[PDB]
């Protein structure tokens, strides 16, 4: 990404939400509700993950310039998504993104009148917030995330089944409920993801006939260090959000 698109610790903390009067914590629920939403619908309307992904990372950086307490974050998730869409060669109807956004959040509401003012002014407000998006975006539409690294390592190293799942697990994870992709790029978080997910199935890569350790093939600067800090703090994030920390132990408990 362009420089303007990782940021520093103090930037983390005073976003324009922070100036809102949103708490921290409250903020970084928010997207992580966000992510949720924009994940529940990319299924229903059978995206790729990759195109997901990509809207995830468009909500992070729409919220590093503006506030969840000016744009709702049912909104903005529905605009990335279909920008998302677009950008990644399975376009979807903004019809189909609206509908699939009320079928997500509102369920047990009647079925959307087409035809209607109201639907009408959603359509338009969803057209503005696009333009608006990609201003904010600096149209910097093109997403590079940790999971085409993940992939590549984990075939190179011979993963199990088990151990290349969990790793693109916790790569999605990462997008999910943390600020990551704002921080660090894709080829760090990857080793971060691969890292916890070896520690978890005790498993050890071998280093090379060189010695390099296998994270030195994926990112040039990484070190141990910052593996095991960045591995503790996901794991910190992920204690504090308790009912996704619950699903992540089922799904472990079910691939055992």
Do not use: A, F, S, Y
């Given at each position: 990404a362009s420089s303007r698109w990782f940021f520093t610790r103090e930037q983390l903390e005073n976003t324009p939400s922070r100036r809102c009067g949103v708490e921290a914590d409250k903020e970084l629920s928010c997207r992580q509700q966000a992510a949720n939403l924009i994940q529940e619908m990319g299924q229903r309307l059978n995206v790729s993950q990759l195109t997901i992904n990509t809207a995830i990372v468009y909500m992070h950086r729409f919220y590093m310039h503006h506030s969840f307490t000016k744009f709702n974050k049912n909104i903005i998730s529905s605009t990335a998504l279909f920008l998302a869409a677009k950008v990644e060669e399975q376009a979807r109807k903004l019809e189909h993104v609206i509908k699939v956004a009320h079928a997500c959040?509102?369920?047990?509401?009647?079925?959307?009148?087409?035809?209607?003012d109201a639907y009408l002014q959603q359509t338009r407000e969803l057209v503005i917030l696009e333009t608006i998006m990609l201003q904010t975006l600096g149209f910097e539409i093109t997403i590079e995330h940790p999971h085409t690294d993940v992939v590549k390592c984990t075939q190179l190293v011979r993963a199990s089944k088990d151990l290349a799942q969990t790793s693109y697990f916790m790569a999605t994870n990462s997008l999910h409920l943390t600020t990551f992709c704002l921080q660090y790029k894709p080829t760090v978080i990857a080793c971060v993801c691969i890292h916890l997910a070896c520690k978890w199935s005790n498993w050890e890569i071998p280093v090379s006939?060189?010695?390099?350790?296998?994270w030195e093939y994926v990112?040039?600067?990484?070190?141990l260090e910052l593996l095991d800090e960045l591995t503790h703090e996901f794991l910190q994030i992920l204690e504090k959000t308790p009912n996704r920390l619950k699903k992540i132990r089922n799904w472990r408990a079910n691939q055992a």
């Open positions: 959040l509102h369920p047990l509401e009647p079925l959307l009148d087409t035809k209607c006939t060189d010695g390099k350790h296998w990112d040039p600067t990484v070190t």
